[PDB]
């Protein structure tokens, strides 16, 4: 996260770290959506341009974290993956459309002060909150600038951007399964996700029921925190039928 701040303790108890076993590195962010399901970006797991095609055994889920590198004994919980499910129509070739995956954990994770799921939006949530100017929150242990890594979880609040602005910022074809967020150059504030924040959550606090909803998944950006560029997020609500399908079947 560029131009964010250190998370408060327990601020994002749905934050998950995808941790590569060998080498030991941060693979991506993710989110906890129940006691056995973790949501992330497909491209965290499968991105043949960059000979990424992790399997379940390659990664751990680390939940309850704050420190990036430290083993937070009695706080984090480390979970093994039972199975990864990548959206079958994930478009890694063109534009990361449907950049979403689910991971089932071998065992349910115990909730604690530090570990707790985020909600997924329903249509009404989406339709209320996913409005240009409405800010969400992105969190991650990714780089602090494009070109360095944080001691702890970083947080940044970023406004959703009007779709034509998103589209005009890039040559890539933006789909209805994406939205973008970030400040405009005129806007003076900054912030973005950056390498290793992929797969983590863009969340919004519903003013109707005071719950956090994960509205987006950190997907991609052209660099980090560049003027006139925006972060692109998977539209969770648009893909929730697939989510529900997977969770319902498996």
């Amino acid at each position: 996260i560029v131009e964010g701040s250190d998370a408060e303790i327990g601020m994002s108890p749905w934050q998950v770290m995808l941790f590569r076993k060998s080498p030991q590195e941060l693979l991506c962010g993710a989110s906890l959506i129940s006691d056995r399901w973790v949501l992330t970006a497909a491209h965290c797991l499968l991105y043949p341009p960059w000979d990424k095609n992790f399997t379940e055994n390659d990664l751990l889920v680390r939940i309850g974290k704050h420190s990036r590198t430290r083993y937070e004994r009695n706080i984090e919980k480390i979970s093994m993956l039972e199975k990864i499910y990548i959206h079958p129509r994930y478009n890694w070739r063109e534009n990361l459309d449907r950049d979403i995956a689910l991971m089932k954990l071998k065992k349910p994770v115990a909730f604690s002060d530090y570990i707790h799921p985020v909600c997924l939006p329903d249509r009404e949530t989406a339709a209320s909150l996913l409005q240009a100017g409405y800010k969400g929150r992105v969190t991650g242990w990714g780089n602090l600038k494009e070109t360095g890594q944080p001691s702890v979880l970083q947080v940044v609040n970023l406004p959703i951007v009007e779709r034509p602005v998103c589209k005009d910022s890039t040559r890539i074809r933006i789909t209805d399964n994406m939205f973008c967020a970030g400040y405009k150059p005129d806007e003076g504030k900054r912030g973005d996700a950056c390498e290793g924040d992929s797969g983590g959550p863009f969340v919004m606090k519903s003013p109707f029921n005071n719950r956090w909803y994960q509205m987006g998944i950190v997907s991609w950006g052209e660099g980090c925190d560049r003027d006139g560029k925006y972060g692109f997020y998977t539209h969770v609500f648009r893909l929730k039928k697939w989510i529900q399908k997977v969770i319902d079947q498996f």
Binding site: S5, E8, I9, G10, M11, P13, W14, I33, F111, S112, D113, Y114, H116, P117, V118, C119, L120, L129, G133, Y134, K135, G136, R137, V155, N157, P159, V203, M204, K205, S206, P207, N210, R211, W212, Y213
Partner: peptide
């Protein structure tokens, strides 16, 4: 049922340092 309510925040009626920024943006 309990999703999206944080033990150290919503569950205790404590706000974090910037969530007001979000609420203020839900104009």
């Amino acid at each position: 049922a309990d999703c999206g309510l944080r033990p150290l925040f919503e569950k205790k009626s404590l706000e974090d340092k910037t969530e007001r920024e979000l609420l203020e943006s839900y104009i």
